[PDB]
């Protein structure tokens, strides 16, 4: 089990308010401790020195108003650090700039809002932290711009593309984390990893609009399908762990190559379980076994 | 061997400070320390058994070694030794020296 | 009540204070000699 982002209203409380005994806030906890009612040891208040004994009585029986503002205003500014509304080095300015703002306006209806906004801003950290795990929000809106600009449902050659419409939508829903459909240049493009080692254009996909339905030769790479760019080829291998059945595997490469993209993944996860064993058995071989990779090469070439 | 014979009364057979003390005096030696600085008053017995150390055998401690050949050139004195440690000769290096 | 707010009728250094730099006081001693940077109280028994 794991925690959510360390509670932003509590992190700032951790650094300000008393830890052990706040005699006013934890009143019936000190009162329980002084009445010899605590289950740990009853006479923990009796065996204590007489002077600090009296300090517990004066503070608990007469509750003293402790300063609450600096654990409320800091609760906003540290949430401003976790929601990233300010930079971490900005904690010197905004903490006091708003304290100087409430120095001028201590006593309007604004601070009655402020503590209600404290509960709102602390929840906004918890809302966004669960929302950044699903980076769908900066992805689906971007795909809405892709679906509108690109002409949808126009394969007047042959139609297998209706299945492909949902295939791109499945990539948004299944993996959301680093999967951002960034619109930097006017061509749309999707990143798969946190460092973006396969971020091809979804407008390199515009090469497929004339190749949505053509004739198939035989079983070896086609006499025509050499036109398919390694840019668009990178996309079609990336949608392959998402959609398989739907596109016709016998009419054009939209389906025949998509089934063949599963052959690339099908070998990969087998060889993953192959490599994790031969590398693990290095005590009995005592060599840099590149034959683990050479057999992997042999299991792809000699078929 | 049985380690509870005649030193039991004298409390010498004992294993710690609070062993053969009355268990109500531990919180006066420790807590009110500089006031009642008393823990050697009841002299706690040592913890030096027979377990791994005892070598009732002709075990070598100090051995000599004197070189094979001699070279008496003016600038660099050379001495060749072919040292051999058999078994259980467990020296720590700072012990070894060269008697000039 | 204000008597023991001056850290006069306190028990100990790292404990009586807010836990924000209690974590940091135990980790930092050579960077800053923090034990002499704050009052440590000691009180009369019964």
């Amino acid at each position: 089990m794991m925690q959510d982002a360390t509670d932003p209203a509590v992190r700032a409380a951790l650094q300000s308010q008393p830890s052990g005994l706040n005699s006013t806030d934890d009143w019936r906890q000190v009162m329980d401790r002084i009445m010899s009612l605590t289950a740990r040891n009853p006479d923990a208040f009796r065996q204590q020195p007489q002077a600090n004994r009296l300090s517990a009585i004066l503070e608990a029986v007469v509750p003293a108003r402790a300063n609450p503002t600096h654990e409320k205003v800091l609760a906003i500014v540290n949430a401003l650090a976790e929601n990233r509304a300010i930079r971490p080095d900005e904690a010197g300015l905004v903490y006091d700039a708003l304290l100087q703002r409430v120095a001028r306006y201590n006593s309007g209806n604004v601070q009655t809002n402020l503590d209600r906004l404290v509960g709102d801003v602390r929840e906004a950290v918890a809302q966004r932290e669960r929302a950044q795990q699903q980076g769908n929000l900066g992805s689906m809106v971007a795909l809405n711009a892709f679906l509108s600009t690109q002409p949808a449902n126009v394969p007047r050659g042959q139609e297998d593309y209706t299945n492909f419409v949902s295939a791109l939508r499945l990539m948004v829903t299944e993996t959301p984390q680093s999967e951002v459909y960034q619109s930097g240049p006017d061509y749309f493009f999707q990143t798969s990893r946190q460092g973006l080692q396969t971020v091809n254009l979804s407008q390199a996909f515009k090469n497929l609009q004339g190749l949505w339905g053509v004739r198939a030769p035989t079983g070896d790479r086609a006499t025509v399908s050499s036109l398919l760019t390694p840019n668009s080829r990178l996309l079609l291998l990336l949608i392959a762990p998402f959609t398989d059945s739907g596109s016709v595997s016998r009419d054009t490469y939209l389906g025949h190559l998509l089934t063949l993209y599963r052959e690339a993944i099908g070998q990969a996860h087998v060889d993953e379980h192959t490599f994790q064993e031969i590398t693990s058995v290095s005590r009995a071989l005592g060599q840099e076994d590149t034959g683990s990779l050479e057999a992997t090469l042999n299991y792809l070439l000699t078929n | 061997p049985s380690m509870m014979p005649q030193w039991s009364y004298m409390h010498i057979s004992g294993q710690d400070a609070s062993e053969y003390l009355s268990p109500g005096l531990v919180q006066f030696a420790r807590a009110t320390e500089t006031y009642f600085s008393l823990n050697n008053k009841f002299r706690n017995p040592t913890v030096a058994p027979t377990h791994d150390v005892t070598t009732d055998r002709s075990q070598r401690l100090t051995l000599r070694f004197i070189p094979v050949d001699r070279e008496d050139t003016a600038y660099s004195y050379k001495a060749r030794f072919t040292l051999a440690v058999g078994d259980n000769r467990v020296l720590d290096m700072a012990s070894t020296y060269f008697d000039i | 009540p204000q008597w023991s707010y001056m850290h006069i009728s306190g028990q100990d250094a790292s404990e009586y204070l807010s836990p924000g730099l209690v974590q940091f006081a135990r980790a930092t001693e050579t960077y800053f000699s923090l034990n002499n940077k704050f009052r440590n109280p000691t009180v009369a028994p019964t």
Binding site: R46, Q47, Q48, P49, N52 | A17, V26, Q27, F28, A29, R30, A31, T32, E33, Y35, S37, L38, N39, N40, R43, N44, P45, T46 | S9, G10, Q11, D12, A13, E15, Y16, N40, P41, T42, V43, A44, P45, T46
Partner: peptide, 24 residues
Amino acid sequence: FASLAPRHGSRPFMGNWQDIGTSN
């Protein structure tokens, strides 16, 4: 007894003790 000594920081007595024997 926990009451018997004056202790630092609101704690009666704190760190326990040990005194060495003569021979060695």
